[PDB]
């Protein structure tokens, strides 16, 4: 790996180590919960963004006709 890539890898591992490693088995479980939730919420914004994307596709399409037929 390029020195630039190992550095990306390491610093990414270091983020894991800085956030997780000092926790005990109890703070650990709570961290897992926190991360889980964050994912869930991010995953929820994604689904709303996906649904809106489809609607915009139809709106863009209707605007296509409207511009055709004129």
């Amino acid at each position: 790996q390029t020195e630039r890539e190992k550095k990306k890898k390491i610093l990414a591992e270091r983020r894991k180590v800085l956030a997780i490693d000092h926790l005990n088995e109890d703070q650990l479980r709570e961290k897992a919960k926190e991360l889980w939730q964050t994912i869930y919420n991010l995953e929820a914004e994604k689904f709303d963004l996906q649904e809106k994307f489809k609607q915009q596709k139809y709106e863009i399409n209707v605007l296509r006709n409207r511009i055709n037929d004129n």
């Binding site: 894991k16 650990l28 897992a32 919960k33 991010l42 995953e43 994604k46 996906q50 649904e51 004129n70």
Partner: protein, 118 residues
């Protein structure tokens, strides 16, 4: 026959008014499904946790994964937001094109009646 004359004006509007009400009704039947659709999708894309019997090593593994998944899921989310943003801009443009492509003296309803009648 004008063959536009077939039924009354009271009828035309009789239905048009109904059309819209099952459309609005269908509009929220959809929004309603969209909800369960979301919960169901979340339940799959973000399965709830089961920390019950995990040891320290396994637990620590999980947190690391989940820590990795927050980066991942967030990028995915960004990429879809970008496509959506772009779309707001492309929509603004198209609309500005259709828009570009394709004082008064009027009587008052309640005002008049109050004037004429006692």
């Amino acid at each position: 026959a004008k063959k536009k004359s077939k039924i009354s004006a009271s009828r035309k509007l009789q239905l048009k008014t109904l059309l819209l009400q099952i459309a609005k009704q269908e509009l929220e039947r959809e929004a309603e499904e969209r909800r369960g659709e979301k919960g169901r999708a979340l339940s799959t894309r973000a399965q709830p946790l089961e920390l019950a019997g995990l040891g320290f090593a396994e637990l620590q593994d999980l947190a690391r994964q989940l820590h990795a998944r927050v980066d991942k899921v967030d990028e995915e989310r960004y990429d879809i937001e970008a496509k959506v943003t772009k779309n707001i801009t492309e929509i603004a443009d198209l609309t500005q094109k259709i828009f570009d492509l394709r004082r008064r003296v009027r009587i008052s309803a309640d005002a008049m009646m109050q004037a004429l009648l006692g």
